[PDB]
């Protein structure tokens, strides 16, 4: 189990990540790049190290969001890979890969890469 | 110096990479995604480890191509990062990052990621 992961996280763009960390190492929740906007809400699932080293190392984790809900389908999926770092300034530092479904000829532009930092405090 | 890097390399898409490895660790040459087509030819510069380990490890290297020549300007640049592996089946395995100039709002789609494998034999 990883105590301080469960809860609401905000990236620097305004997006909200709401997650529950299961004792089993399961991450379950929703991602919304808007303010309680249902059309901007998507389901996420992931995994985290439920028994991290005690030496001050961070807690490795990862999650995926397929960009399809009841209002839209962007034919793409993003995976965030990173680690949770506890403390008064808790944060989840990540790197992401956004892949779009493409034809074979267009596969060269299928994957974008970037990074996000989530904190527990509003934007 | 790294003996077998200088020469003509081909990726699996048909692109041609012509490079000269300087004794100083300098990589200089041209990249053309076409057949001797001048409008498809771009200048490249990079660096490589000129005194690699002898234990069978590969030779680390990297190069950049800004996509602007006398016929076109795609307002973007690609960096390839990888290593040279000698032998009868010489090859340069790489991972690349293609960044396009964007406005601040469009920065999320600025960088694409992919990979290429170059061999000395035609496609």
């Amino acid at each position: 189990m990883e105590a301080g992961i469960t809860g609401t996280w905000y990236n620097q763009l305004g997006s909200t990540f709401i997650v529950t960390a299961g004792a089993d190492g399961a991450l379950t929740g929703t991602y919304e790049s808007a303010v309680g906007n249902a059309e901007s809400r998507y389901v996420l699932t992931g995994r985290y190290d439920s028994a991290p080293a005690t030496d001050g190392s961070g807690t490795a984790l990862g999650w995926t969001v397929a960009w399809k809900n009841n209002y839209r389908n962007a034919h793409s999926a993003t995976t965030w890979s990173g680690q949770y770092v506890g403390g008064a300034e808790a944060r989840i530092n990540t790197q992401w890969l956004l892949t779009s479904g493409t034809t074979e000829a267009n596969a060269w532009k299928s994957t974008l890469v970037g990074h996000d930092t989530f904190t527990k405090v509003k934007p | 110096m790294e003996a077998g890097i200088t020469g003509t390399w081909y990726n699996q898409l048909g692109s041609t990479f012509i490079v000269t490895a300087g004794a100083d660790g300098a990589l200089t040459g041209t990249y053309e995604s076409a057949v001797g087509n001048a409008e498809s030819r771009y200048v490249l510069t990079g660096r490589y480890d000129s005194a690699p380990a002898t234990d069978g490890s590969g030779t680390a290297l990297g190069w950049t191509v800004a996509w602007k020549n006398n016929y076109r300007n795609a307002h973007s640049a690609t960096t390839w990062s990888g290593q040279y592996v000698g032998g009868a089946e010489a090859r340069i395995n790489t991972q690349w990052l293609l960044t396009s100039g964007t406005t601040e709002a469009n920065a999320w789609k600025s960088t694409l990621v992919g990979h290429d494998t170059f061999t000395k034999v035609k496609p």
Binding site: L13, S15, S33, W67 | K109
Partner: peptide
Amino acid sequence: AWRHPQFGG
């Protein structure tokens, strides 16, 4: 081009 939903699109 169009705002992807990940970025408030």
